mmCIF file with all atom_site columns, C-alpha atoms (C1' of nucleotides) in Angstrom:
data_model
loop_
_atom_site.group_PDB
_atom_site.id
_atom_site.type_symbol
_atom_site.label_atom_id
_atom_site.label_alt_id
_atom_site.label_comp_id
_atom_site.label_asym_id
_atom_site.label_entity_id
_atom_site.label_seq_id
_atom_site.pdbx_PDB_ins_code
_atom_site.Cartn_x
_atom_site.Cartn_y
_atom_site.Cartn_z
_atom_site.occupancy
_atom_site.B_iso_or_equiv
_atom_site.pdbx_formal_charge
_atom_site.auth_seq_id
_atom_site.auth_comp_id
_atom_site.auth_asym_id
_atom_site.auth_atom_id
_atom_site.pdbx_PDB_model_num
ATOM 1   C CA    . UNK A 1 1   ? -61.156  67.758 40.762  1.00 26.52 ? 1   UNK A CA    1
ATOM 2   C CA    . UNK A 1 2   ? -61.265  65.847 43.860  1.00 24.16 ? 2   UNK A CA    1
ATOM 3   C CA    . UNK A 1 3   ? -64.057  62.976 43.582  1.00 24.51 ? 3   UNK A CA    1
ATOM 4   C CA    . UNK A 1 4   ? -66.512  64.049 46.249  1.00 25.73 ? 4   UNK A CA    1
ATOM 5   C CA    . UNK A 1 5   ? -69.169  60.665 46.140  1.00 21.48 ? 5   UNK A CA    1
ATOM 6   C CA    . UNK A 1 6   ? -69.954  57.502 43.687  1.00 24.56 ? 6   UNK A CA    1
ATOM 7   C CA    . UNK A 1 7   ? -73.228  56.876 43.429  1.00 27.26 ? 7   UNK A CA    1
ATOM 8   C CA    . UNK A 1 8   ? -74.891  53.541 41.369  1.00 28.01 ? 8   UNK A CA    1
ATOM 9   C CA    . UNK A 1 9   ? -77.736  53.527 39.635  1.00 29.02 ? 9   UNK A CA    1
ATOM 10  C CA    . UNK A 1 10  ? -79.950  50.818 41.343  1.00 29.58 ? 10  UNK A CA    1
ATOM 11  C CA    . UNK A 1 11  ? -83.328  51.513 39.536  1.00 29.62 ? 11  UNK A CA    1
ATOM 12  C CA    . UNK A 1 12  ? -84.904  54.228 37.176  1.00 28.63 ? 12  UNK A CA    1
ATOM 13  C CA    . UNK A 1 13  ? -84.991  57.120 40.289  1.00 26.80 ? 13  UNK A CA    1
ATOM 14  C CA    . UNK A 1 14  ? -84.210  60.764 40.360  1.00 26.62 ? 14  UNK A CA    1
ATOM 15  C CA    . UNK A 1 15  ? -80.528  61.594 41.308  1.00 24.55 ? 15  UNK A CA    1
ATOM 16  C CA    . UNK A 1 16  ? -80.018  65.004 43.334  1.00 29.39 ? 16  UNK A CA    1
ATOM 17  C CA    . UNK A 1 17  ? -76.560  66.629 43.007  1.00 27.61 ? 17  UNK A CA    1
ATOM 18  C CA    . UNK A 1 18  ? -76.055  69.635 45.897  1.00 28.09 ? 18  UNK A CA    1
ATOM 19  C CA    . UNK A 1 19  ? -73.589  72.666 46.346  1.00 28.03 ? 19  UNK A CA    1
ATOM 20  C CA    . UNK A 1 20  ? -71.729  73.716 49.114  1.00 27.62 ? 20  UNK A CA    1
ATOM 21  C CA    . UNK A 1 21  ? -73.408  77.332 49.316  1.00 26.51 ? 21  UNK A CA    1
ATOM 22  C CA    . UNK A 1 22  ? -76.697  75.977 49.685  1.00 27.51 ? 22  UNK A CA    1
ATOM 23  C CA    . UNK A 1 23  ? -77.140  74.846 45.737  1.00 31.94 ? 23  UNK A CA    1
ATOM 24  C CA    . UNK A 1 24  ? -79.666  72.473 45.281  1.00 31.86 ? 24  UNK A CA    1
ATOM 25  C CA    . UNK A 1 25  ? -80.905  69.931 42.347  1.00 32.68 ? 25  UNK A CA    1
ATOM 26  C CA    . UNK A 1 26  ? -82.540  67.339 41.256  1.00 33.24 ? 26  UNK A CA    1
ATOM 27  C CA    . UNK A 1 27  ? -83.054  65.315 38.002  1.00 33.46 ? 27  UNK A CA    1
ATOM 28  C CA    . UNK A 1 28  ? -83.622  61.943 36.719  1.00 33.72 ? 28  UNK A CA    1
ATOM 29  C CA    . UNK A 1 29  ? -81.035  58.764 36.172  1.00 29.78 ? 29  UNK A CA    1
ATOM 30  C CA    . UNK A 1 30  ? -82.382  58.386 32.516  1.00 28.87 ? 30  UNK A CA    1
ATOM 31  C CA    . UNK A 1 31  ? -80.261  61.999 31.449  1.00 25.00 ? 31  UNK A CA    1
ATOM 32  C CA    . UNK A 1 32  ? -76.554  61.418 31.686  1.00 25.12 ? 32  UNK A CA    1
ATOM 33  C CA    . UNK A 1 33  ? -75.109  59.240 29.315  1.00 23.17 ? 33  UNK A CA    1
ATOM 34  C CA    . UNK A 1 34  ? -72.979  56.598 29.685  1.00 25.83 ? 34  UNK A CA    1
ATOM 35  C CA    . UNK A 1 35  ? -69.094  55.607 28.587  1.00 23.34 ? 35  UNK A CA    1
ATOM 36  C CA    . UNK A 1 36  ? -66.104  53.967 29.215  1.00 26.64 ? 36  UNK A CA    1
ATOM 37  C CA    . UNK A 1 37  ? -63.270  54.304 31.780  1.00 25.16 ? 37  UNK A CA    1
ATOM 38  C CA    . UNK A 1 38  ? -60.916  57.770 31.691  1.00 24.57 ? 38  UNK A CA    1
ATOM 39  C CA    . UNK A 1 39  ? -63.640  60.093 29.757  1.00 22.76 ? 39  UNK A CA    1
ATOM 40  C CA    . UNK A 1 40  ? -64.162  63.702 30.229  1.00 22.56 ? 40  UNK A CA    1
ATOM 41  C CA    . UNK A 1 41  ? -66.968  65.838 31.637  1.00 22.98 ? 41  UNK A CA    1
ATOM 42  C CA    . UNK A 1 42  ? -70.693  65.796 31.863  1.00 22.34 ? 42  UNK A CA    1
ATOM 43  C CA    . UNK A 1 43  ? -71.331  69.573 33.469  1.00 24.14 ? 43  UNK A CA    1
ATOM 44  C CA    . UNK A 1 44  ? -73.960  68.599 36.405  1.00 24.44 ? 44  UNK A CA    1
ATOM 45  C CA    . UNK A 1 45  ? -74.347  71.820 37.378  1.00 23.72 ? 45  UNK A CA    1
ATOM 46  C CA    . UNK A 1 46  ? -73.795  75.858 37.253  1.00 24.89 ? 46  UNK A CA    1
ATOM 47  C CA    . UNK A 1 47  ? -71.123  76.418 39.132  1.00 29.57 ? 47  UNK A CA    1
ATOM 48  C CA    . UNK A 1 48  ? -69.459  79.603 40.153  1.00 30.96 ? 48  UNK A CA    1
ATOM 49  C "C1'" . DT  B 2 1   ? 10.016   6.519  143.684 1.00 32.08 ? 1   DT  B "C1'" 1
ATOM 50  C "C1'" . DT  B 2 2   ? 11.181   9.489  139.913 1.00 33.38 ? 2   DT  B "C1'" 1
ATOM 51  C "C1'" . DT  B 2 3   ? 10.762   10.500 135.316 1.00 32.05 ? 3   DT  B "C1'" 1
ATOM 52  C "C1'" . DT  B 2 4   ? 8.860    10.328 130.182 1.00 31.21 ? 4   DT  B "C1'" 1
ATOM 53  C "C1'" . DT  B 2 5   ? 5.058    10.275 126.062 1.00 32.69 ? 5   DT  B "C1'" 1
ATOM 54  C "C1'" . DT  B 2 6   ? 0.603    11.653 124.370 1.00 31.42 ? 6   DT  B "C1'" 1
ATOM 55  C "C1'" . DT  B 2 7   ? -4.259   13.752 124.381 1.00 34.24 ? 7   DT  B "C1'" 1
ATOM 56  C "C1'" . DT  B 2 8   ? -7.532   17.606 124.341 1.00 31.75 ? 8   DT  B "C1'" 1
ATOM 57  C "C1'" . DT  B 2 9   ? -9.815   22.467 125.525 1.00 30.74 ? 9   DT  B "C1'" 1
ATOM 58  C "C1'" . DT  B 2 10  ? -8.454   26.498 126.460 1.00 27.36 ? 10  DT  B "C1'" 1
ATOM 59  C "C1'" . DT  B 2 11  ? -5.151   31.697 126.294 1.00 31.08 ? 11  DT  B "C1'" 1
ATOM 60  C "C1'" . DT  B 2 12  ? -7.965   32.122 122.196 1.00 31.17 ? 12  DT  B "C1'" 1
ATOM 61  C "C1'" . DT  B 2 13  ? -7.883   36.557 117.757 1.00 29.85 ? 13  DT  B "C1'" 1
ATOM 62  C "C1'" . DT  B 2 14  ? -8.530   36.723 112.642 1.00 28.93 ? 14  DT  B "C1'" 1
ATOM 63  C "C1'" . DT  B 2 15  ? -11.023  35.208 108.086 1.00 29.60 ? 15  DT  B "C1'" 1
ATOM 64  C "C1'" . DT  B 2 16  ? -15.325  34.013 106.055 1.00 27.66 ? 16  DT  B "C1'" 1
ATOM 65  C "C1'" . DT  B 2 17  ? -20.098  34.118 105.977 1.00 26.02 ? 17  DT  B "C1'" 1
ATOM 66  C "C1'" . DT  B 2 18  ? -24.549  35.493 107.538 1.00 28.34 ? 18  DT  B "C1'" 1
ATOM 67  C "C1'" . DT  B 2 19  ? -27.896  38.603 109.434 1.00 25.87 ? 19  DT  B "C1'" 1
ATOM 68  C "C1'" . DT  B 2 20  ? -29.912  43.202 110.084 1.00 24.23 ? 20  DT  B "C1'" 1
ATOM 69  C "C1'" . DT  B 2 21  ? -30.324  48.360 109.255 1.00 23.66 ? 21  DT  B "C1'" 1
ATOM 70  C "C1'" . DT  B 2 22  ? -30.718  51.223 105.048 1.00 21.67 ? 22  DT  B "C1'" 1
ATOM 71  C "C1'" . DT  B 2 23  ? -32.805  54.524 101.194 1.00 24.20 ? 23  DT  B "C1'" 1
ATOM 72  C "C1'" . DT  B 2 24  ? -33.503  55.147 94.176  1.00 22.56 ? 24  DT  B "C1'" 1
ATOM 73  C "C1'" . DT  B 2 25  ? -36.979  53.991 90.995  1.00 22.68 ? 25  DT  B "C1'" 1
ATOM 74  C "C1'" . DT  B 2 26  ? -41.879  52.885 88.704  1.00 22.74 ? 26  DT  B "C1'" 1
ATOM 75  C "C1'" . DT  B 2 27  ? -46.591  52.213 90.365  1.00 22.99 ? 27  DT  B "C1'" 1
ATOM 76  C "C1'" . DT  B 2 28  ? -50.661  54.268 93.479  1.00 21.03 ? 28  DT  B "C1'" 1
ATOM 77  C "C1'" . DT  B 2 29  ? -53.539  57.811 95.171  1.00 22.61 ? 29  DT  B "C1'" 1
ATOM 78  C "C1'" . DT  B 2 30  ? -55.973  62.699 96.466  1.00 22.76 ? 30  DT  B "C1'" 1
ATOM 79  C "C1'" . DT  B 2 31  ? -56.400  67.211 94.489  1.00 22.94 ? 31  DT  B "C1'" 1
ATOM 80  C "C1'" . DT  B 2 32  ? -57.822  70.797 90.978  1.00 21.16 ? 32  DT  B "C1'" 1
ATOM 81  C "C1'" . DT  B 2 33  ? -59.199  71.537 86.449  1.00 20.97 ? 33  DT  B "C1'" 1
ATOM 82  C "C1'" . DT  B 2 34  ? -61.763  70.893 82.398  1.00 19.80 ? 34  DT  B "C1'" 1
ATOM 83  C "C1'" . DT  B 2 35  ? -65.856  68.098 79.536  1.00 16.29 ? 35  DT  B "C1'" 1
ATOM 84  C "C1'" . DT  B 2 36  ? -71.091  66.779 80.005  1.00 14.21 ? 36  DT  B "C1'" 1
ATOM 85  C "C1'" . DT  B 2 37  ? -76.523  67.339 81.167  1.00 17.07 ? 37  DT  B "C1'" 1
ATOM 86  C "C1'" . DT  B 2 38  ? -81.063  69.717 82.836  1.00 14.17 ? 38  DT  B "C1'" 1
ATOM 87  C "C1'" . DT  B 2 39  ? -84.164  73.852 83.757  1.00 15.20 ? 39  DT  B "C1'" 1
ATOM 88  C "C1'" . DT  B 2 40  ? -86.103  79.701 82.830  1.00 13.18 ? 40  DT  B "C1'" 1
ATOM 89  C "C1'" . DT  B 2 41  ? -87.169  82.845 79.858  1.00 13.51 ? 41  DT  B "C1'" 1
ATOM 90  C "C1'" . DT  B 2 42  ? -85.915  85.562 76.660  1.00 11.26 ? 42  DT  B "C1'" 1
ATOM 91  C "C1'" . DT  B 2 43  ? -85.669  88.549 72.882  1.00 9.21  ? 43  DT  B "C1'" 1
ATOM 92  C "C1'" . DT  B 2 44  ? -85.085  86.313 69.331  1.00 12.95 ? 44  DT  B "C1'" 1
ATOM 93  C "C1'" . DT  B 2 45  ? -85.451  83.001 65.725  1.00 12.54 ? 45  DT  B "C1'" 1
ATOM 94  C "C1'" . DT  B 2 46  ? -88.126  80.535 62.791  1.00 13.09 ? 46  DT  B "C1'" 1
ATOM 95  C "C1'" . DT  B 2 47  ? -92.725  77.902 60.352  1.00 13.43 ? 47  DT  B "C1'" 1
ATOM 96  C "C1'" . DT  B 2 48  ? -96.575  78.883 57.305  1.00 14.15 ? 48  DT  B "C1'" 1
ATOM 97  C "C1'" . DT  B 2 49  ? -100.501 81.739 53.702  1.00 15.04 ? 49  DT  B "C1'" 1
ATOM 98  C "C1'" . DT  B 2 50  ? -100.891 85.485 49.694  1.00 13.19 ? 50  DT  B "C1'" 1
ATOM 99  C "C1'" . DT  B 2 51  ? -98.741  88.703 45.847  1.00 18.29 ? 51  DT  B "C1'" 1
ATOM 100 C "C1'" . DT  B 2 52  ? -95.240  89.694 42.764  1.00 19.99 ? 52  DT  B "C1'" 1
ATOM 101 C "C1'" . DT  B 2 53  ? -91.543  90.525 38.760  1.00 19.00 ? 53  DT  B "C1'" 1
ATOM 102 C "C1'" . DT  B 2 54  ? -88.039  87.591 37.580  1.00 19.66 ? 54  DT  B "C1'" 1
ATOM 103 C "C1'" . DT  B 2 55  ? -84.251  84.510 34.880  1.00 22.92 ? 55  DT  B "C1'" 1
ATOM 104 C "C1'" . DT  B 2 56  ? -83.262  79.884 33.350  1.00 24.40 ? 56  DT  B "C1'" 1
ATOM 105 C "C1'" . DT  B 2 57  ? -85.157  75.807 30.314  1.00 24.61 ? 57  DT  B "C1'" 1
ATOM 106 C "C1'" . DT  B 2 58  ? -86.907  74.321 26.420  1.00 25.52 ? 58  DT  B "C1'" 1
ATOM 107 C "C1'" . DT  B 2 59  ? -88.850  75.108 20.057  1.00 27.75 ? 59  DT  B "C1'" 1
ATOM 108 C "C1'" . DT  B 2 60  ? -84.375  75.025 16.417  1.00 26.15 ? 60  DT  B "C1'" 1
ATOM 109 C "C1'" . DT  B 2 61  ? -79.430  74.915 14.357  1.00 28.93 ? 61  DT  B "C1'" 1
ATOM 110 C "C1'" . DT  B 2 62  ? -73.918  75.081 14.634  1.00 30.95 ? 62  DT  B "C1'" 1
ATOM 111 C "C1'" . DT  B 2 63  ? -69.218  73.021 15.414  1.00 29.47 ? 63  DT  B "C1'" 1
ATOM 112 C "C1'" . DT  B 2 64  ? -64.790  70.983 17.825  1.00 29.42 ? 64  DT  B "C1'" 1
ATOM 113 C "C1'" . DT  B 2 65  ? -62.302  68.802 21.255  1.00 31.67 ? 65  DT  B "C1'" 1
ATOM 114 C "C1'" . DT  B 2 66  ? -63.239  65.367 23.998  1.00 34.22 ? 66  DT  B "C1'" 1
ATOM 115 C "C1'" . DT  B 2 67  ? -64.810  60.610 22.358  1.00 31.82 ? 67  DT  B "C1'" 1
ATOM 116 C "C1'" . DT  B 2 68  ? -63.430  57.257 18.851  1.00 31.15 ? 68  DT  B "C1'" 1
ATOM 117 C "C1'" . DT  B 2 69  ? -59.321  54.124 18.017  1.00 30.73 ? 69  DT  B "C1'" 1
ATOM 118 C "C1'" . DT  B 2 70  ? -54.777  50.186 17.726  1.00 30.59 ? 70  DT  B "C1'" 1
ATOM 119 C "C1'" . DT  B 2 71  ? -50.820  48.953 19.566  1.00 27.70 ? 71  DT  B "C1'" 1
ATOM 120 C "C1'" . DT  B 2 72  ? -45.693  48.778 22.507  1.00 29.11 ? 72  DT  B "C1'" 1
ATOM 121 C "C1'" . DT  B 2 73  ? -43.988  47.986 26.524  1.00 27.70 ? 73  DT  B "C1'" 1
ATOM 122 C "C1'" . DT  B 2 74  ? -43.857  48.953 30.551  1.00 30.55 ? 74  DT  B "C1'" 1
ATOM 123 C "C1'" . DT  B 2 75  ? -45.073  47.414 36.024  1.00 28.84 ? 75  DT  B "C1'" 1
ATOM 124 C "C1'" . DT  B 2 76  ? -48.419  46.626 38.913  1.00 29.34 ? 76  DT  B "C1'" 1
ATOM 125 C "C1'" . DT  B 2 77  ? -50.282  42.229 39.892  1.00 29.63 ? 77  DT  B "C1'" 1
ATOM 126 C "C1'" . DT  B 2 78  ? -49.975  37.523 41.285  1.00 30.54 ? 78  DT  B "C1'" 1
ATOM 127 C "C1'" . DT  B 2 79  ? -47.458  33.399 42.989  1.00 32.20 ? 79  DT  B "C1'" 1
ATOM 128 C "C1'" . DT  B 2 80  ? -44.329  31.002 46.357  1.00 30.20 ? 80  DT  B "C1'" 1
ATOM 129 C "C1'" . DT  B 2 81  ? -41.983  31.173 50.499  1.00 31.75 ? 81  DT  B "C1'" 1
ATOM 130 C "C1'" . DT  B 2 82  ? -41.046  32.545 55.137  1.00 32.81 ? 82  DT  B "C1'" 1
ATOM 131 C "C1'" . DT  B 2 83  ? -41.623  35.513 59.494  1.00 32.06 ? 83  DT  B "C1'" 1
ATOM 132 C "C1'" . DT  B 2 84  ? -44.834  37.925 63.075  1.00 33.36 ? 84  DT  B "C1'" 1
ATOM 133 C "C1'" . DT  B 2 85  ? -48.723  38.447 65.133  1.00 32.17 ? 85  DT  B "C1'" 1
ATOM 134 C "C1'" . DT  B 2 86  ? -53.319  36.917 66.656  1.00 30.41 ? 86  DT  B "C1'" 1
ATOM 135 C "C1'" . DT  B 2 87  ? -56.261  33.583 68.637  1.00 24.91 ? 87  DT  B "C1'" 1
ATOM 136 C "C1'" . DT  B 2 88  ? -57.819  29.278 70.814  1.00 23.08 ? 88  DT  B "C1'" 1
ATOM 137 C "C1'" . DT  B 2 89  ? -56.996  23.872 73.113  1.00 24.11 ? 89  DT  B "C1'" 1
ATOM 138 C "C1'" . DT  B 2 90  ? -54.389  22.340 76.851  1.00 23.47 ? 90  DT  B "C1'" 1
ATOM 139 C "C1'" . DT  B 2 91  ? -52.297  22.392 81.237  1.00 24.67 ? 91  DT  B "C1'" 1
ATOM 140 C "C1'" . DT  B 2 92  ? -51.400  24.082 85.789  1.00 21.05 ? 92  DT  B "C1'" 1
ATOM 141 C "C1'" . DT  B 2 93  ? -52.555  26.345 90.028  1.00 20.19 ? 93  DT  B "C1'" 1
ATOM 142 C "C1'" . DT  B 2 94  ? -55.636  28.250 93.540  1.00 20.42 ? 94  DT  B "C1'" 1
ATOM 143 C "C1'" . DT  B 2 95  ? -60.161  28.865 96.161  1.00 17.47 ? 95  DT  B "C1'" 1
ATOM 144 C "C1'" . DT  B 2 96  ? -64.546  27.361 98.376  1.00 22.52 ? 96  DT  B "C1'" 1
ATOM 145 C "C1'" . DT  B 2 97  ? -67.581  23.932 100.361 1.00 24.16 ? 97  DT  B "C1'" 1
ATOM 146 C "C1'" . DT  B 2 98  ? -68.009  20.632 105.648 1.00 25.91 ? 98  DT  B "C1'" 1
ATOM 147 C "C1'" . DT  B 2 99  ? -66.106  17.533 109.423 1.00 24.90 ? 99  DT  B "C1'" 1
ATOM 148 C "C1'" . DT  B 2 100 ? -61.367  16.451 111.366 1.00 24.78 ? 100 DT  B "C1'" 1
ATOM 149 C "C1'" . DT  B 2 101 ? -55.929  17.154 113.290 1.00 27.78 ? 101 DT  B "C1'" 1
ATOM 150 C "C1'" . DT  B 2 102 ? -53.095  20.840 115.425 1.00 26.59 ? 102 DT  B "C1'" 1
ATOM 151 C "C1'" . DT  B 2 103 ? -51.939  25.356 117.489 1.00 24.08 ? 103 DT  B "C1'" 1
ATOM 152 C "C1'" . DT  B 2 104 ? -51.009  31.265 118.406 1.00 23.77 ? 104 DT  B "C1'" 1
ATOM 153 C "C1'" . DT  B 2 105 ? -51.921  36.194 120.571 1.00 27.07 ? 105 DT  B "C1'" 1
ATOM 154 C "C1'" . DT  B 2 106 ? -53.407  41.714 122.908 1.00 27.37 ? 106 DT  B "C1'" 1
ATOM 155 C "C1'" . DT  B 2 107 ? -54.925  44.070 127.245 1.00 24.82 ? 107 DT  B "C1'" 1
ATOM 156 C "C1'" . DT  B 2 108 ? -56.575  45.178 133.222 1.00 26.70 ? 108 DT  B "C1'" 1
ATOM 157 C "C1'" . DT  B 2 109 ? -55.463  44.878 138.266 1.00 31.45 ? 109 DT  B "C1'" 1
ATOM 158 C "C1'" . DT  B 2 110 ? -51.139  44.976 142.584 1.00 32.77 ? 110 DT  B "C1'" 1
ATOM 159 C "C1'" . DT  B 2 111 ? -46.708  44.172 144.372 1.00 31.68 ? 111 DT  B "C1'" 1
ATOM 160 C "C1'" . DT  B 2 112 ? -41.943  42.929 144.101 1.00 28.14 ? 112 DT  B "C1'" 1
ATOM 161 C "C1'" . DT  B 2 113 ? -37.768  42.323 141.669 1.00 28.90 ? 113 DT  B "C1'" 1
ATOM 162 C "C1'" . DT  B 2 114 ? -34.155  43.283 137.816 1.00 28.16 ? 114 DT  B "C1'" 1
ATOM 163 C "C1'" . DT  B 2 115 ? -32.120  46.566 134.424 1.00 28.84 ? 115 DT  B "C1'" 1
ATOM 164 C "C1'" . DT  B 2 116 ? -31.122  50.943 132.333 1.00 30.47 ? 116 DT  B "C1'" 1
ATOM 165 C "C1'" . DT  B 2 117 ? -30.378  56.237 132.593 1.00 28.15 ? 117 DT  B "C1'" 1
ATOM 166 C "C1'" . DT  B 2 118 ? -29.475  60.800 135.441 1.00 30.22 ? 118 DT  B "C1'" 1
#
DNA sequence: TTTTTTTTTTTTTTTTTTTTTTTTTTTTTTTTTTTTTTTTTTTTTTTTTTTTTTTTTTTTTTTTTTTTTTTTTTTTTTTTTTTTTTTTTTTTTTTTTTTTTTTTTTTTTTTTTTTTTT
Protein backbone atom coordinates (compact mmCIF):
# COMPACT_ATOMS: atom_id res chain seq x y z
CA UNK A 1 0.00 0.00 0.00
CA UNK A 2 2.31 2.54 -1.20
CA UNK A 3 0.68 6.18 -0.73
CA UNK A 4 0.35 7.34 -4.31
CA UNK A 5 -0.96 11.38 -3.61
CA UNK A 6 -2.43 13.60 -0.53
CA UNK A 7 -4.88 15.66 -1.50
CA UNK A 8 -6.71 18.58 1.00
CA UNK A 9 -9.92 19.48 0.94
CA UNK A 10 -9.88 23.30 0.19
CA UNK A 11 -13.68 23.87 -0.45
CA UNK A 12 -16.94 21.73 -0.97
CA UNK A 13 -15.63 20.36 -4.77
CA UNK A 14 -15.78 17.03 -6.44
CA UNK A 15 -12.63 14.81 -5.88
CA UNK A 16 -11.69 12.40 -8.93
CA UNK A 17 -9.69 9.26 -8.00
CA UNK A 18 -8.11 7.43 -11.44
CA UNK A 19 -6.65 3.88 -12.27
CA UNK A 20 -3.73 2.94 -13.95
CA UNK A 21 -5.62 0.89 -16.81
CA UNK A 22 -7.52 3.74 -17.84
CA UNK A 23 -10.13 3.69 -14.64
CA UNK A 24 -11.78 6.74 -14.18
CA UNK A 25 -14.03 8.53 -11.30
CA UNK A 26 -15.38 11.12 -9.87
CA UNK A 27 -17.41 12.04 -6.71
CA UNK A 28 -17.93 14.68 -4.24
CA UNK A 29 -15.69 15.81 -0.95
CA UNK A 30 -18.94 15.69 1.22
CA UNK A 31 -18.83 11.37 0.99
CA UNK A 32 -15.82 10.07 2.83
CA UNK A 33 -15.80 10.41 6.34
CA UNK A 34 -13.43 11.61 8.48
CA UNK A 35 -11.05 10.15 11.56
CA UNK A 36 -8.10 10.19 13.37
CA UNK A 37 -4.43 9.28 12.67
CA UNK A 38 -3.49 5.26 11.92
CA UNK A 39 -7.24 4.14 10.79
CA UNK A 40 -8.09 1.61 8.27
CA UNK A 41 -9.72 1.69 4.84
CA UNK A 42 -12.32 3.65 3.00
CA UNK A 43 -12.57 1.38 -0.47
CA UNK A 44 -12.42 4.37 -3.21
CA UNK A 45 -12.77 2.23 -5.82
CA UNK A 46 -13.31 -1.36 -7.67
CA UNK A 47 -10.25 -2.58 -8.08
CA UNK A 48 -9.05 -5.69 -9.77
C1' DT B 1 131.48 45.51 -7.14
C1' DT B 2 129.29 41.38 -5.55
C1' DT B 3 125.82 39.37 -3.04
C1' DT B 4 121.17 38.91 -0.18
C1' DT B 5 115.74 39.60 1.02
C1' DT B 6 111.07 40.18 -0.56
C1' DT B 7 107.04 40.90 -3.92
C1' DT B 8 103.78 39.38 -7.47
C1' DT B 9 101.81 36.92 -11.98
C1' DT B 10 102.55 33.24 -14.20
C1' DT B 11 103.77 27.32 -15.39
C1' DT B 12 98.99 27.14 -14.01
C1' DT B 13 95.26 22.15 -13.23
C1' DT B 14 91.47 20.79 -10.00
C1' DT B 15 87.04 21.88 -7.10
C1' DT B 16 82.82 24.38 -6.98
C1' DT B 17 79.22 26.65 -9.16
C1' DT B 18 76.64 28.21 -13.03
C1' DT B 19 74.72 27.92 -17.58
C1' DT B 20 72.67 25.38 -21.45
C1' DT B 21 70.73 21.14 -23.84
C1' DT B 22 67.14 17.74 -22.60
C1' DT B 23 62.42 14.92 -22.61
C1' DT B 24 57.28 12.64 -18.31
C1' DT B 25 52.93 14.35 -17.02
C1' DT B 26 48.08 17.00 -17.04
C1' DT B 27 45.81 20.39 -20.00
C1' DT B 28 44.36 21.68 -25.16
C1' DT B 29 42.56 20.74 -29.59
C1' DT B 30 40.55 18.37 -34.26
C1' DT B 31 38.01 14.31 -35.50
C1' DT B 32 33.94 11.04 -35.61
C1' DT B 33 29.87 9.76 -33.44
C1' DT B 34 25.52 10.33 -31.39
C1' DT B 35 21.27 13.78 -29.72
C1' DT B 36 17.98 17.59 -31.73
C1' DT B 37 14.60 20.19 -35.33
C1' DT B 38 11.81 21.02 -39.86
C1' DT B 39 9.22 19.48 -44.17
C1' DT B 40 5.95 15.40 -47.56
C1' DT B 41 2.59 12.48 -47.65
C1' DT B 42 0.89 8.68 -46.29
C1' DT B 43 -1.99 4.99 -45.12
C1' DT B 44 -3.35 5.44 -41.14
C1' DT B 45 -5.22 7.23 -36.96
C1' DT B 46 -8.54 9.68 -34.77
C1' DT B 47 -12.94 13.37 -33.72
C1' DT B 48 -17.94 13.56 -33.86
C1' DT B 49 -23.75 12.11 -34.65
C1' DT B 50 -27.40 8.04 -34.02
C1' DT B 51 -28.97 3.19 -32.06
C1' DT B 52 -28.57 -0.29 -28.82
C1' DT B 53 -28.58 -4.01 -24.76
C1' DT B 54 -26.12 -3.72 -20.74
C1' DT B 55 -24.39 -3.92 -15.44
C1' DT B 56 -23.65 -1.11 -11.40
C1' DT B 57 -26.12 2.23 -7.91
C1' DT B 58 -29.59 3.13 -5.16
C1' DT B 59 -35.26 1.54 -1.97
C1' DT B 60 -34.27 -1.72 2.68
C1' DT B 61 -31.91 -4.71 6.45
C1' DT B 62 -27.70 -7.50 8.68
C1' DT B 63 -23.30 -7.93 11.39
C1' DT B 64 -18.05 -7.75 12.81
C1' DT B 65 -13.55 -6.17 12.70
C1' DT B 66 -11.75 -2.09 12.19
C1' DT B 67 -12.95 2.07 15.21
C1' DT B 68 -13.46 3.05 20.13
C1' DT B 69 -10.29 3.30 24.29
C1' DT B 70 -6.28 4.16 28.70
C1' DT B 71 -1.92 3.75 29.87
C1' DT B 72 3.79 2.23 30.22
C1' DT B 73 7.79 3.24 28.59
C1' DT B 74 10.25 3.61 25.28
C1' DT B 75 13.19 7.12 21.69
C1' DT B 76 12.73 10.29 18.55
C1' DT B 77 12.92 15.09 19.39
C1' DT B 78 15.05 19.19 21.09
C1' DT B 79 18.88 21.80 23.27
C1' DT B 80 23.85 23.22 23.61
C1' DT B 81 28.20 23.16 21.66
C1' DT B 82 31.57 22.98 18.07
C1' DT B 83 33.29 22.17 13.12
C1' DT B 84 32.70 22.89 7.82
C1' DT B 85 31.03 25.02 4.31
C1' DT B 86 28.94 29.01 1.97
C1' DT B 87 28.75 33.78 1.03
C1' DT B 88 29.91 38.72 1.11
C1' DT B 89 33.15 43.40 2.79
C1' DT B 90 37.79 44.48 2.17
C1' DT B 91 42.13 44.72 -0.01
C1' DT B 92 45.34 44.27 -3.73
C1' DT B 93 46.72 44.29 -8.48
C1' DT B 94 46.29 45.33 -13.39
C1' DT B 95 44.49 47.88 -17.64
C1' DT B 96 42.99 51.95 -20.39
C1' DT B 97 42.75 56.85 -21.32
C1' DT B 98 46.53 61.34 -23.47
C1' DT B 99 51.01 64.05 -23.59
C1' DT B 100 55.98 63.17 -22.22
C1' DT B 101 61.08 60.47 -21.48
C1' DT B 102 63.75 56.71 -23.69
C1' DT B 103 64.96 53.09 -27.06
C1' DT B 104 64.97 48.09 -30.49
C1' DT B 105 64.63 45.19 -35.10
C1' DT B 106 63.85 42.15 -40.42
C1' DT B 107 65.00 42.30 -45.45
C1' DT B 108 67.37 44.02 -51.02
C1' DT B 109 71.48 45.24 -53.92
C1' DT B 110 77.41 44.31 -55.05
C1' DT B 111 82.00 43.30 -53.86
C1' DT B 112 85.61 41.86 -50.82
C1' DT B 113 87.27 39.55 -46.87
C1' DT B 114 87.26 35.80 -43.02
C1' DT B 115 85.89 31.10 -41.48
C1' DT B 116 84.36 26.41 -41.91
C1' DT B 117 83.94 21.81 -44.62
C1' DT B 118 85.46 18.51 -48.69
Amino acid sequence: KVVSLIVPRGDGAILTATQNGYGKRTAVAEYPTKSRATKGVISIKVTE
